[PDB]
């Protein structure tokens, strides 16, 4: 028994569930109350854009969402909230502090952690991007030939890679004026050399997004980045003109030899899946310009005191934290779909992967006891409409329930044909959400095809794969524009959202102990590759293919 | 009751699984039997390179592989199998055969439909892509200013993308001496939009992939194209210069200004999530040549032989299928996530969400009757070692039981550094599954935590959020070396794999009427969205998103 599971608002949620789950019926509620729009959105004025959060094709009803709100009361929702934007040490098993709302705080409000107000350090930092972007933009930084910087290349992994690919991407149109930006992460050589291939080292940039400066993947690929640097330069002073760090590890820095005026500094409380606040944004600020990245905090700033301020019943993130809850842990749905129709979020959902799985993809609660119910779900997805003619057939008549999140903004960035490819990116978007809600009956199938002259043979057998049973829920999420705070406002809130759903769990959103040991058991088998020899060191399957991996390198295809 | 659900074999399993299921732990499994590698793994060798499919990490005995083969015997997958590569009409709904096993048949085996070889038609299309591709590799194919071609870009949707999209990123390194090509797909005009802002008229070919070339999302796409193209050239006889077509609507074709002479045709049986072999493939071609299409064509061929002659209990497909249903029907796993530590396969994963899903997200049998089991998974993933710093945390630590198939090549196409980059890609490859079936004991996270000096309480405090369960089951496919033909060789084996659960789930593997709805409803609301006026045709969430639409359609940001 867990805290969630003792919980009586939880159990309050379970026993009306299995007494009414019966009777939600998505089609019969709208029929049912004219209203039901107005009562399940929400609608947000950032004074930058708004935002309709419509969750009204949710198989909830008023109880249910009541319901919802008295199990995040009980369950210290905004006591929680309150620790972490206090600077308390909610990070429990790491003793730490959890402080990403420290790196877009604008209002310069102080937080304090052990006795020490952060603001100062984190606007030092800033100040520091800034003057840095300002130097490499206007081609004031000179490359070793006098060149100036026509590349950036950010190297780092998972989250010191995934948030500022993610943003770039998304914002891509703000991008006039910068340099291109490169994202190299894989260990696997195929994307260093791919990219180097591609770059003139008298006008490239590296980044080193390390912390430590000592993480294995990123470090090699830094190293390999030099290597082919100092091929053409030579001189290895030349480095200091081309090789930047974000990590706090001065004297690997040096030794790198990155001059260290250029190390953008980060704290431990910024959590890698919530960095790309922090310096780690560094070629998110390059490539679209400081004043961009700081509508970016500005956003996630509005948000994070929409957060803060707003009753649960009305709370952006919480209302979705809830809605998540409901359907995993009373309709035990494994995943979450996020479906943007945006190409420029094409990796928005990639994003999601890190910052909800990674946070929430837990097992241990705050007191040690295992939990003794679901926690995070999976999350997957394409942008629409490319997802729509991949995988939604599933969606509509396979045998999973699946709840996703349907995203688009109002106005594009490209409103060429005087609109119509978004006149029809629009009505996708709202089409498949209602055809997830209404279905298609046997009834309305039947006269389809007898209007289609079909013959009563043909009717009979084609009838049942022409029906669409319906009753899939949808949160659909409009805002006006993707701009660069409409971002940073709409991944806060999903930040907020995973938050939420770790303090109902009792887990601990912000650790990661289950990378430990691959990372232990990849070091044991590295050397163990080297030479000809046999390995039988490990249970038979990991010999195996050790084994094979030896026999076929050597082949000759 | 359907098909699955009254099979005696089936209702073995069940029985199986009810009475031994916690006698499955891969730890013990492997302790227990020193040869399970080699009782639970095969090695294809293809003369063109080996594939080592081990299945031996998988909470499978001898009993279970044999109720398993025997459940393939019973639901008559042999039997479907040959009723497929006969030409026989087994898109049951459709009344259509699914032929793309002719697409690649390089035997020239007759196959008939209807009583009539498809060979020659098959062959005649590939000599007319033969023929093309040199003409436009070699320079002789010019633009209308008299440049050579630079840049291809492939306009389609779904089948028409996906796959010619993860072929050419796979096979990358091929693509010596031949065009770069792009991949417009989605009706977001972003995507359009930021496509031609990189090209030149002069020495662009776009292909427009639409079987019927009515296409609403390719056909846009298409004409904002040429409208851009004729922006430039003016002259609409220059578009049969820059515009060809995979359709077979010779009329539609014309009109639309493409010469009749650059029409490659495809045929009913070709299904488009199955459709890359045919002329949908000419973008392949196009950029790596047509010799190494023929290879990628050549390996799907060894791989349907493979299917074709080896017992159910060594068949690859066969056996990956039978492993997949243990897991859905008897586990009750949501998912499967498709894992290639492998930059180029970066799009295989995703490649797979539409052959898998739109293949067998379905829940009506042949007869009629709906499924009372589930059917298709949820396909997802990432490339390692990208995916591995995303949401492996909740693959080892979460509360979902997760199949993984891993896959590598044992020869990378970049060896830099000396091969230290893929000595650790290996590596972590090899940790990962090992680290995913053995987890780590609280004793055996204990000793770590008293060597690393904790204090007893501060032991106990941390010990059980390092525990890893483990009995997380995974497959490692690891391949020679990824080449046209292996890559061939490799979607073929995942082509058969969905086939065979089709069968075995008595669904239509096919057919895709899911589609259906959703694209009803968006040509109802198109027209809607033109104007101020207040939508009230629908129901109260779909009316309230469109009337926010309208409302800030008109807000400055």
Same mark, same amino acid.
């Given at each position: ?91 429990? %098993? ?61 190297? /780092? ?22 340099? #291109? ?8 050589? %195929? ?22 400066? %000592? ?92 957060? #803060? ?14 809605? /998540? ?127 289609? /002259? ?15 049973? /319906? ?64 390995? %039988? ?21």
């Amino acid at each position: 028994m867990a805290a969630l599971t003792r919980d009586p608002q939880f159990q309050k949620l379970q026993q009306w569930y299995r007494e009414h789950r019966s009777e939600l019926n998505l089609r019969r509620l709208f029929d049912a109350n004219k209203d039901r729009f107005n009562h399940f959105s929400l609608t947000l004025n950032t004074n930058h854009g708004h935002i309709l959060v419509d969750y009204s094709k949710n198989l909830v009803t008023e109880d249910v969402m009541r319901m919802l709100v008295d199990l995040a009361k009980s369950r210290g929702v905004e006591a929680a909230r309150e620790r972490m934007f206090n600077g308390e040490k909610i990070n429990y %098993t790491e003793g730490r502090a959890v402080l990403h709302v420290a790196l877009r705080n604008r209002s310069n409000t102080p937080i304090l952690v052990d006795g020490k107000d952060v603001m100062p350090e984190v606007n030092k930092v800033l100040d520091k991007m800034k003057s840095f972007c300002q130097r490499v933009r206007s081609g004031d930084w000179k490359g070793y030939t006098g060149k100036t910087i026509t590349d950036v290349i950010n190297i /780092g992994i998972g989250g010191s890679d995934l948030g500022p690919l993610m943003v770039t991407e998304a914002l891509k149109p703000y991008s006039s004026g910068g340099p #291109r930006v490169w994202y190299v992460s894989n260990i696997d050589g %195929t994307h260093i050399a791919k990219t180097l291939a591609q770059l003139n080292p008298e006008s490239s940039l590296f980044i080193i997004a390390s912390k430590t400066f %000592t993480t294995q993947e990123t470090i090699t690929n830094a190293e390999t980045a030099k290597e082919w640097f100092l091929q053409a330069a030579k001189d290895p002073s030349a480095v200091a003109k081309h090789f930047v760090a974000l990590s706090t590890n001065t004297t690997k820095v040096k030794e790198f030899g990155i001059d260290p005026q250029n190390m953008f500094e980060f704290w431990d409380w910024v959590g890698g899946r919530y960095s790309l606040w922090s310096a780690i944004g560094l070629s998110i600020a390059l490539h679209v310009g400081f004043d961009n990245f700081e509508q970016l905090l500005s956003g996630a700033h509005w948000m994070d005191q929409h957060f #803060r301020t707003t009753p649960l019943e009305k709370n952006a993130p919480v209302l979705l934290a809830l809605l /998540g809850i409901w359907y995993i842990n009373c309709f035990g749905c494994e995943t979450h779909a996020m479906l943007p129709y945006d190409q420029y979020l094409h990796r928005f959902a990639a994003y999601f992967q890190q910052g909800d799985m990674e946070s929430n993809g837990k097992y241990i609660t705050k007191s040690g006891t295992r939990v003794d119910h679901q926690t995070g779900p999976i999350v997957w997805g394409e942008p629409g409409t490319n997802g729509q003619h991949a995988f939604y057939q599933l969606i509509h008549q396979g045998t999973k329930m699946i709840p996703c999140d349907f995203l688009i903004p109002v106005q594009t960035q490209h409103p060429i044909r005087k609109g119509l490819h978004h006149k029809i990116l629009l009505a996708n978007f709202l089409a498949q959400t209602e055809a997830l809600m209404r279905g298609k009956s046997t009834e309305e199938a039947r006269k389809e095809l007898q209007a289609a /002259g079909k013959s009563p043979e043909d009717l009979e057998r084609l009838l049942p794969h022409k029906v669409f049973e /319906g009753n899939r829920p949808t949160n659909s999420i409009v805002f006006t524009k993707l701009t660069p705070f409409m971002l940073g406002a709409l991944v806060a809130m999903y930040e907020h959202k995973i938050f939420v759903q770790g303090i109902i769990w009792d887990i601990n959103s912000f650790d990661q102990w289950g990378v430990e040991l691959g990372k232990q058991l990849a070091k044991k088998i590295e050397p163990e590759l080297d030479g000809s020899a046999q390995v %039988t060191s490990h249970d038979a399957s990991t010999n195996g293919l050790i084994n094979f991996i030896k026999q076929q390198r050597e082949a000759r295809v």
